[PDB]
Design an enzyme around this catalytic site. Sequence first.
Site, PDB file in Angstrom:
ATOM      1  N   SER A   1      -1.925  10.149  17.577  1.00 38.31           N
ATOM      2  CA  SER A   1      -2.051   8.912  18.353  1.00 38.31           C
ATOM      3  C   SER A   1      -1.814   9.070  19.857  1.00 38.31           C
ATOM      4  O   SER A   1      -0.929   9.814  20.287  1.00 38.31           O
ATOM      5  CB  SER A   1      -1.095   7.855  17.804  1.00 38.31           C
TER       6      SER A   1
ATOM      7  N   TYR B   1      -9.251  -2.004  17.385  1.00 36.73           N
ATOM      8  CA  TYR B   1      -8.747  -0.659  17.166  1.00 36.73           C
ATOM      9  C   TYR B   1      -8.589  -0.380  15.673  1.00 36.73           C
ATOM     10  O   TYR B   1      -9.127   0.591  15.143  1.00 36.73           O
ATOM     11  CB  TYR B   1      -7.398  -0.490  17.874  1.00 36.73           C
ATOM     12  N   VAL B   2      -7.829  -1.240  15.009  1.00 33.47           N
ATOM     13  CA  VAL B   2      -7.606  -1.168  13.571  1.00 33.47           C
ATOM     14  C   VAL B   2      -8.913  -1.155  12.775  1.00 33.47           C
ATOM     15  O   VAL B   2      -9.051  -0.391  11.828  1.00 33.47           O
ATOM     16  CB  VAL B   2      -6.731  -2.362  13.115  1.00 33.47           C
ATOM     17  N   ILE B   3      -9.868  -2.003  13.150  1.00 32.06           N
ATOM     18  CA  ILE B   3     -11.154  -2.061  12.440  1.00 32.06           C
ATOM     19  C   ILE B   3     -11.958  -0.776  12.599  1.00 32.06           C
ATOM     20  O   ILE B   3     -12.481  -0.259  11.622  1.00 32.06           O
ATOM     21  CB  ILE B   3     -12.011  -3.295  12.869  1.00 32.06           C
ATOM     22  N   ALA B   4     -12.041  -0.260  13.825  1.00 28.11           N
ATOM     23  CA  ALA B   4     -12.735   1.005  14.109  1.00 28.11           C
ATOM     24  C   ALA B   4     -12.139   2.239  13.396  1.00 28.11           C
ATOM     25  O   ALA B   4     -12.867   3.108  12.953  1.00 28.11           O
ATOM     26  CB  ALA B   4     -12.789   1.241  15.616  1.00 28.11           C
ATOM     27  N   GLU B   5     -10.814   2.290  13.303  1.00 26.77           N
ATOM     28  CA  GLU B   5     -10.055   3.403  12.731  1.00 26.77           C
ATOM     29  C   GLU B   5     -10.110   3.444  11.203  1.00 26.77           C
ATOM     30  O   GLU B   5     -10.230   4.508  10.589  1.00 26.77           O
ATOM     31  CB  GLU B   5      -8.610   3.214  13.163  1.00 26.77           C
TER      32      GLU B   5
ATOM     33  N   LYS C   1       1.448   0.030   5.805  1.00 25.49           N
ATOM     34  CA  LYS C   1       1.631  -1.155   4.973  1.00 25.49           C
ATOM     35  C   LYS C   1       0.298  -1.664   4.434  1.00 25.49           C
ATOM     36  O   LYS C   1       0.167  -1.988   3.254  1.00 25.49           O
ATOM     37  CB  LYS C   1       2.340  -2.267   5.743  1.00 25.49           C
ATOM     38  N   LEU C   2      -0.696  -1.729   5.310  1.00 31.66           N
ATOM     39  CA  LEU C   2      -2.014  -2.162   4.892  1.00 31.66           C
ATOM     40  C   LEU C   2      -2.466  -1.337   3.695  1.00 31.66           C
ATOM     41  O   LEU C   2      -3.025  -1.873   2.743  1.00 31.66           O
ATOM     42  CB  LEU C   2      -3.020  -2.044   6.039  1.00 31.66           C
TER      43      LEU C   2
END
EC number: 2.3.2.22
Length: 214
Positions: A26, A159-163, A188-189
């Site tokens: 990251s 960011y989360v959606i792309a990753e 967690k997701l």
Amino acid sequence: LFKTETLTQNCNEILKRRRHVLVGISPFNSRFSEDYIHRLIAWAVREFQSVSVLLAGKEAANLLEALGTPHGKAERKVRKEVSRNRRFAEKALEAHGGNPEDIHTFSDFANQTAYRNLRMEVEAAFFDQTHFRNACLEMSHAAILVEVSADMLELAVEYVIAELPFFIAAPDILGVEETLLAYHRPWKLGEQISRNEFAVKMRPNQGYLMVSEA
């Protein structure tokens, strides 16, 4: 040297075969220092047949923008940070016997079919299911990590959606048989995904490996 904790009994069976590991790194995260990256990769090359590195794509700027950093400076800042993560990983990979070309960013596949299909699966879930949408926003909160607004979250969530496709199937994107995503944080997701709480599913050849120092 490193202790590991799997997501599911399936994640555990992939772990037993030691085929491929995809090591996430990251940008702007105090965890990843030259020495840390060197140790992690060292351990990866020892423990697995094949090691790959995953860096942050263009949407990493969305995080900086959520923190109020202006758009143009945000892209330049992310470019510097990520290219620096890359240099550190290249060094380590070279030094320990891995392949320096095995580094990717999650933006590198934008036009690839397998990547686009997966991103569509995640977007459909994001927009249709409220539960999933909120799980995702929680996760993007986690990424930005002085108050946090709902608009900041609608920004960072890109960011989360792309990753996410690299979390649910890396193998389809990279062309590898099976893989584990190694990272230091709990996901967690992922725990919710694994329990079938959403329309998004983890592929049987993917697993999440939480890795911590020893």
